[PDB]
Motif scaffolding. Sequence first.
Motif: not given
Lengths: 126, 89, 58, 902, 839
Positions: E759-760, E786-791, E796-798
Motif C-alpha cells: 500500500t505504500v 485498474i479493476r484488480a487494483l480498485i477491487d 483504503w482509497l475511499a
Amino acid sequence: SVQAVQVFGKKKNATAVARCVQGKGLIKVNGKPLKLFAPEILRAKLYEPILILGTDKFADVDIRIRVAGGGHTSQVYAVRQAIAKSIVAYYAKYVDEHSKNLLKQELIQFDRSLLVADPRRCEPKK
Amino acid sequence: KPKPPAPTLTVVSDVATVAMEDAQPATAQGVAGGETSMIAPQEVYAPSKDTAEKGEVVTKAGIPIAKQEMSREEKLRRRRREKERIRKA
Amino acid sequence: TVQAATKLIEQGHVRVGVEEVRDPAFLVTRNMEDFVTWTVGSKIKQNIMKYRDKLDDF
Amino acid sequence: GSAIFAPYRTIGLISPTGVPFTSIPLGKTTFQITTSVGRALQTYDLKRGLNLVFVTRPQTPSDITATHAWKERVYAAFGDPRNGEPQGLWVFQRGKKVAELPLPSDLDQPIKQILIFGGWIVACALTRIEVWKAATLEHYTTIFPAASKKGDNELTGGAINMPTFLNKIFVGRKDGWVEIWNVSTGKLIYTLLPPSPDCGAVTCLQPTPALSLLAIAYSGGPLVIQNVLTDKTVLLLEAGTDDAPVTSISFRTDGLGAGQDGRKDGVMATATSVSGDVTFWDLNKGGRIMGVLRSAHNPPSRHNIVRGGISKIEFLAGQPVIVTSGLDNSLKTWIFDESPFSPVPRILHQRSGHAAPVRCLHFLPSDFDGAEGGNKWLLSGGKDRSLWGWSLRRDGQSAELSQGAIRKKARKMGLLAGTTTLEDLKAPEITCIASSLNRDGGMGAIPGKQMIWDKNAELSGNTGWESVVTAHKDDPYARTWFWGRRRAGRWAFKTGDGEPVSTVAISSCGTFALVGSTGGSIDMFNLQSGRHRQRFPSRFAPGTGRHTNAVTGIVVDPLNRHVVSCSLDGKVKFWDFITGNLVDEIDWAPMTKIIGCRYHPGNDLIAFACDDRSIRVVDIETKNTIREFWGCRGDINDFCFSPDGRWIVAASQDSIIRVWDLPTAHLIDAFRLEQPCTALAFSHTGEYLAGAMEGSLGVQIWTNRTLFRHVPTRQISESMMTLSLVPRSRWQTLLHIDIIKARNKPKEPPKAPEKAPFFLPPVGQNGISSLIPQETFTSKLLVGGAKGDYTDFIEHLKALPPAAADLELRSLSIGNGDEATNELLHFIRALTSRLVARRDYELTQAWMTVFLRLHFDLIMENEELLQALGEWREHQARERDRLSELVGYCGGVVSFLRSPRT
Amino acid sequence: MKTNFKFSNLLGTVYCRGNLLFSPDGTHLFSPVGNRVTVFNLVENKSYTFPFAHRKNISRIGLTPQGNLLLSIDEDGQAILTNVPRRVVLYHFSFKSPVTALAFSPSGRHFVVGLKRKIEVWHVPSTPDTNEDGDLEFAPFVRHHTHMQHFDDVRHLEWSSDSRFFLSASKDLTARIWSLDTEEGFVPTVLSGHRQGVVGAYFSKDQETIYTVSKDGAVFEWKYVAKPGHEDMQWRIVNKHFFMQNAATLRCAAYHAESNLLVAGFSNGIFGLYEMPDFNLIHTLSISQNEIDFVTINKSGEWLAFGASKLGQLLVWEWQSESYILKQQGHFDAMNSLVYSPDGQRIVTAADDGKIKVWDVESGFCIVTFTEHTSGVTACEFAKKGSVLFTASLDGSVRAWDLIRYRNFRTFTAPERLSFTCMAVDPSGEVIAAGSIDSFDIHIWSVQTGQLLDRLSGHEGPVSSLAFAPDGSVLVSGSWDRTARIWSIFSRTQTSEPLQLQSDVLDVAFRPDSKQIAISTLDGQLTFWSVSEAQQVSGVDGRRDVSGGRRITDRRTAANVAGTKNFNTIRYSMDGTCLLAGGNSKYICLYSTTTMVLLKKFTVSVNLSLSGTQEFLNSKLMTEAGPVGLLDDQGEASDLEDRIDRSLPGSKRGDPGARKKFPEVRVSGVAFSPTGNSFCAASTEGLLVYSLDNTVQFDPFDLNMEITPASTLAVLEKEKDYLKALVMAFRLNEAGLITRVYQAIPYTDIGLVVEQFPTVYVPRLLRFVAAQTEQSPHMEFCLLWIRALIDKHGPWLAANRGKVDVELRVVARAVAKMRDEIRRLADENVYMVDYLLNQ
C-alpha cells in the motif's frame, strides 16, 4: 549612526510608543520598570513576549515605553503589543531577516494580537 | 461605467460544435463529441399550444389530450387553473 | 506643485490603486482620484509619518 | 580515448609557455596579438580590449615551439624530435589549418623561430636554418653555419632581417659572431665580431628604426648598436649583469618619448628573462636610462611554485603602447602618457590567469532558469592563492575575484621593487569552495565600500549579501566572497575549535555558512549579519555527538531540516538543523576513513569517498548505503555527480578517470590521462566536465558526447483486446471528415477570376498528395481475400491520410456478381478476421462505423454478405460485452471512490 | 510531491515576428514564438518547443534539407543551431550584424546569409549526429565567401536547384546572381530596373528564366537572350506584369519552381496566387485585416503558410481544395487569467483583447474562441463539473458558457452598472459571486435562476480576490481595506468573520482539503490562515524572493523598485503542499506550505526584447538622450501605416493604438494541472507550461544494494516472482524497467500480484497504470490492472480520498478516454448492424 526603532501599540484607547535602541537589557515603562508598571495579575500578560522569545533576544536591546489612555487592561495589552512589535522591528532592521522571520513565527504561533491589533468593529448579524 | 445593456440576439444553427470550433487539421473532441447539435431538444421541438392540433390540447406535461375525450370534471378543473393563472397575472 | 509631482512620479513613489505608475501622463478619472496614494516602501511616506510622529517601523 | 568525454578546450590559459607572442597590425586601427596555448594559438584583438578572436584548431600533436603571424595566416612550428615527439610546421588562417610545410627528412632538431620576408620563410632550428619559398610554400635550401668547436655552432639568439637589405638574414651564434647570410644563393657574406670579446653569446638582436643599424645583445652584458654595412659601433651600453643577460629588446617607432621633455625620439625597452622588470633607455646623448618599470610580471624564483619571467616585449608600430607577455600566464599592454611626461608607462590592458596549477574547481549554481544557466561560470581556486571566475561563454568576461587593493598594497610596500611576495600578500591556497546565489545581489550587493574579512541589515535584506564561502589551506578562518561584485566578502568565520578549517558548506537558501574544523567542531554562521548561530552539537544523549577527528564533507538538506556531516575517522552524523542535536549516526569506523562527500539535491543521495579506495552512495532519507563502487588503484583525488544522478565520475591518483553508472551499478568508461587529475567539476546542466590537472596551469573542458549522439556503452570493464499504434488524430478525423472540412472551408470564398485557369499545374507526387505512401487498394483487398490473410490490406489501409481513406472506403463496389470479385464482402470479412485476431479494436470500430454509414443500402438490399455481417455481429457482441463490462466497472467504481458521501 | 520542474512546451501563442518553415516531409510546421521555436506536427495533432531560448526575438529560421539541423537567428545575429530529432542545443555562434536574409543550400553543404549589405556564404558544420567518430569542435563554422558588391539591405536569398548559383534580392532595387565557385562562362551580373526594391528573386526549374518580384507589385521575367542588334547575349527582360492590388504594396512572395506557381502576400492582407509562366490568377483572398508578413510554401507544393506579425495570425492554406488546414490566433493583448479544465486536457485563457480561447495542451492549438465580450476579459473560472465556464469582464457582464454546446446560456449584470474585475463560483455550479473596483459591494447571482441573489457588504474598499471553498461552504473575499472576509452564505445565518491584515489584499487561494487558506498582501507577504478557527498559522515575507526588476523607464535601482515586490496571484498544488506564487515580476516562487521555505524559483523569460528581465541593465545602452531603447524610431519606417502613431497619451491598460515597444514582464495568472506533474503561467511572451522531469533523472524511492536492472530482469525471467520483480522496479523508479516488467507479467497473475502488492506503492502504481492506459496500446491489460487494483484496495482509497485524489483523477480520465472513444463506437456499431440485419 545610532540604532533606534520606534514602534506603536494600540488597544481601545490606550496607545504605547516603544523606542528600542542598542543597550544593556532594560525595559522601562513611563520611567518606571516593567516589573512595576501593571496590576499585580496582568504582569503575566506583560511578560508574555519575553517568555515566548527567550531572554537572549532581549539581552542586547533597551526598550522605553510611554503609554496613555485606556484603562489598566487596555494599557497592559498596549504595552505587550509594543514590546513584541518593537523587538521584531529591531530584528528586522539591525540583524538578519531569518531572525526576524523566526521571531514573527514564534509570536504568531502564540498570539497574533502581539503583532496585529484587531479593532472591534460593529457588525452583528445582518 | 460600461454601457447600458441593450438587447442583442444571436442566431445559432443546427450544425455540430465542430462547426463552431476553430480551423485545425483534426478536432480536439473525440468520436462521441461532434454529434452535439448546438441546439437542445427543447429548441428542436417543444410541444405547446401554438403548435398543437385543432381538436387536441397540450397539458403542462407536454402530452396531447383531446377536448372530446376529456371529461366534464377535468374540463372544469382546467378552466379553473387557467382562470387562476389569469388572476395571478 | 506640479513640477514636484512630476518628479515624484518619475522617481516612482505614486501608485494608482494597486499598481505603481511611472508614466506622468496617466489620466486619473473621477473614481481613481479616490485611489491614488503613495507606494509601499516609500521614503515620502516615511517622511509624512515622521512629521506626524506616527513612524511605525513595523 | 574515452567513450563519454571528448576534449573541447583548455580554458583559463592565455600565455603559459616560453613561446613569445607575435603582433600583426590590422589596418590602421587594430592589432592581433597571437600567443601559444601549448597545443594551439590564441589571437586577441587590441582595440576591442583583449577579447579572444581566434583559437587554433585542430590541436597539434606536440607542443608548439615557434610562431609567427604574416598577412592573415599564422605559422606555427611544433615538435622537439630529440625526445620522441613528432614535429612539423603548420599554416593556420582564422583558426583552421589551411596548409602544411614540408619539413626536410634529416631534421632532428627543435625549431626555435620563424621569420617571413620577401617571398621567403626562414626557420632557425638550433644549428640549422631551413628556408621555404612562400608564394609556392616549397623547400628551397638549407643554411648550415659551421664552427671549429662543438659549442660555437649553436644558433642562439636567432636571425632577423634588416628592412632595406635584400635577401639577407642576420644570425647570432653561440660564439659572439653575428653572421650575415644571403638566403638566395645560400652564401655567408659577412661576419661581424663582438666588441671586447669577454662577452660570449649573442642573446638577441633587433633592427633599429634607423637604417642599417642593428642592436645586438650579448650574454656578457653589452648591448651594441652597429652599422651593419660599415661594421662600426654606434652605441655601446652595459645593459646587463653577467648573471642577468638582456634577452628581449624593442624600439619605440613613434617619434617622441625621450630627452626629459618627451618631444625627442629614441626610446628602447629591454627585459631579461630572469627578472620581471623592463627598462627604458633614452638613446640620445650617450644612451642613458630613463626609467625601470618594476615587476611588470612576477619575478621568477627557482624556490617558489609561482612561475614568472618576461617572455617578450614589443612596442607596437608607431604607437605609445608596449605589449609585454610573461611566463606567469599574463599579457599586459602599457601606454606612455603624453601631456605629463611619464618615463615609465601605465597599464591599460591586461589579461591574466593562474600563475600556478589549479587546486579546486566548482561550477557555479544555476541562475534559476536565466541566461547564465548552470554552465557559464566556473570558479577555480589556484595554487597561486587566487580565486578566478572563469566564463566558458566568452573568455574576456572572466576576472579575478579581488581580495582588495593587493597591487596597491604591494606597491606601498616594497614588494614590487624587491620581506614576502605578492602571492604571500593574499589569503592562503584554497582547499574547497561552496556557493549559492539565492541571495547574490548582483553588482549592487551592498552599496558603498565594505571592509574585507572583518574577523546594518535592512539594506542587506533589500539587495543581497555574500554568495561564496571558501575553506583555505592552513588558516583557522573560512573566508567569504561576494560573487556578483567579484570581490572579497566582509566576513571571515573562525572555527570555534581554533584548528584550521577542513570543510565548508553553504545552505541552499544562501543564508547559513557552515564551517567544519580539522579538530572536529562544526559551526554555523548567518551570512547577512555574520553571526554565530548554531554549533554542532549544541550545549542519543543531547549535547554529546562531537567528532573526534577532522570533518570533511558537511552538507545541508535543501529543506533546512538536517545537516549531514562526515568525519575523517569513521562515522557520518545526521544532525537536526534548528536544534543542533545529533539525530542519527552511521559508523564505518573500524574499516573506512572517509575523505570526502558530494551531495545531489533533487535526488537525496550522498556519495562518500573513503580511504579504502571506494565510493559509498547512501540515501539520506532511508539512511542506508545503496551503492558501493570499488574501482580505484590510488587515492581518489576528486569525484562528482551527474545532474541526472545517473553517473558518478571519479579521478584518482593513478591518472585514470572512471565513470560509474549508478542505477546499473556498473562501470561505463575509464580513460587514462597524461597527468593525474587534481580536481573535477561537472556543470549544473549536463554538457561540460572540467578537470584541473597536475602540473598544467588552466583547466581542461570535456564535453558530454551522450547528450548529442547516443553511445551504447554499458561495458563492464577492468582495464487481450489491443489497440493500434495509429494516431488518434488520424482515425478520429477519418470518422468525422465531413464537418471538419466544412469548418475548414473559409467564410467568404476565394475571389476566383471569371477566366479561371482550367488545368492547374500538378502538385504533389504524381497528381495525388505526398502523404499517400508509394508502392490499387481493391487489388490489395482482393488478393488478400484470395489468400487467407488480410494483414497486407489492413497494414496498407492503416497508413493512409483520412481523405484518401474515406475515398478508398467509398470506392468499394459489388461489381461482377461473384463472391470473389466484390469488395464489400471481403472488407467485412477482413474486419471479422481482425476481431478474431484481437488486434486493432478502435480502428475496426471506426472503419465499420463509416462503412455502415456510407454503404447501408447495398448491404441491406443484398443477402450475399448478411452472413458476413452476422458473423461480425457475433464476434463484436462477445468482445463488446466483455470490454463494456470491464470499462463500465472501472468507471463506476472510480466515480464512487472519488466521492462516496451523497 | 517532487518539486523538480523543468521547462516543457510554451503554449498560448502560435506565431510572432519571424520566418515560417515547413519540414522536408511536409508535415511539421516550424514557427517562432518570441525567442523559441515551436514545432507543430500536423499529421498527428502534436506540438513541442525546442529547449533553447534566445536573448532577443527570433529573426530567421533555416533548416538543412536533410531535415536534421535547424539554425535560428535572433535579433543582433546570435545564432543557435540545434538537432531536431534529438531536441538538443548544438552550437552557438554570433553573426555580428542583424541577419536580414538566410538560405540553406539544397545540396546541404552551404548556407548563405545576408547581413545588411554583406552576403556571406558559410559552410554547414559537421555534426556529432552525422559523423561516427566525431565531437563538438570549438568554432565549427568556416566562412567560404563574402560579397559586398551591394548597396542596401539584402532582403532575400534563393539558391539554385543544382546549388551552384544563388540570387540576392535587395533594397537598392537590383537583384544579383552569384556563384559558389568560379564558373567558366559566368560573370557575377546585376539585374537592374525596378521602382521600389525587390522582394524576391527566384530561379526557374530549368535555370533559364529567373523572376523578380518587387515591392510595388510587379513581377518581371529575366532571360539570357541577345541584345536587340542581333557570344553577345545579356540577361535582359522579356515580359513584365503587375499585381493590381490597388492601394497596397506586397510584403512577401514565394515561388514553387517544381510546379511553377507564385504566391504573393500584400499589405492589405489579401494574398493572391498565380500560375506564373503565363500569369493566370489562380485565386486570391483576404486572410487577415492587418497585413501579411511572411509566406512560405510546401516542398510538395500543396500547402501554403502565412504569418501576420501584428496579431498572432498563423495560417496554412490548402489552395487546390480551397480550405484552411489551420487558422490560429494567439492573444494580441495581455493574458489576464487562465484556468485548467478539471480533466486537465485543455486550458482556457482570457485576455484583454476581448476574446477567450480554449487551448489544447497537446497540439497547442486553440479549439474555440468565444468572442461575445465587448471589453477586456478578467478572471475566468470552472465549476467542479468542468462542463460550464464562467467569465467576468470589464463590460459589466459575468457570462456563463456551456462547453458541450458552445453558447452562453447565462449573462449576469449588476443593476447599477459595474465593471467586474474578479469572480468566483461555487463548486456546485449554482452560485456566482463577483466583485469590481467601482463599488465595494460583492454581487451574488444564481446560475439556475438567473437573477441577482444578493449584494454582500461589509468591505470598506474594492474587493480584489474572491474564492469559493472547494467543499462549497465558505466564500472568502479579500479587499483593499486591508481586510479579508470569511463569508458563510449557504447556512441559515449569513455571517462574515473579518481577518484584519497589514496591507491591501492581492490574492486569495484555498487548500484543496479546505482547512487552510493563503492570502497574499501588498507588502509582499503570504499569510496562511485557518478557516475553522480563523487564526493565522503561517507566514512568508517574500519581497526579496520575487524582487527582480528594473524596466526601461525606471529611475530606481531594481532593489528599490516597489511594485514588483508582491504576489498578484497564488495557487496551491493539487497535493496541497506547495504554493506557487507570481506577481508583476520576472520570478515565479514555489513555496512549501508546511516547512515555509522556498523550494524552487523560476525565471519566466530570458527574452531581452521584453522590458524587465534583467535586474542590472548595462551602461552601453545609455546614451546622452536617455536609454537607447527609448528613442522613438517610428519615423525611420518605409511604410506609412508603420509610421503613423495612433496612440493615446497615458493609457496603461490597452488602447487599440498600442505602441507596445519593449513590453513589461508580468505573470498575470498561474495554475497547477489537476493531473499533477505540471503547472503553467501566463506571461507576456506566452503561456509557459512547466512540468516534472522524471525520465531524465535517476531518483530511487527506497533502494537496497542488490537491486539493479540486471537483478530485476533476473528475478523476472529466471525466478518468475512477479510481485518481487514489480516491487523492485517501482523501487528503482526507472520507467523503462517498470514498463518491461509490467508488460511481462501475465494477465492471470495480475490478481495475485495486486493482492500481495504494498500500500505504500499503491498510488504510484495507480498513476502508472493511468498513464499506460492513456498512452500504450494494451488497453484491456491496463483495464484488468485498474479493476484488480480498485477491487483489492477499495476501502483504503475511499478511506483516504485526499492523499490519493490526483491518482484517482488521472485514473478517472484514463477510463473516461476509453469510455468515450471505443465503447460508444462499439455500441453504435452493434445497434446499426442489428438493425441492418433485421432489415
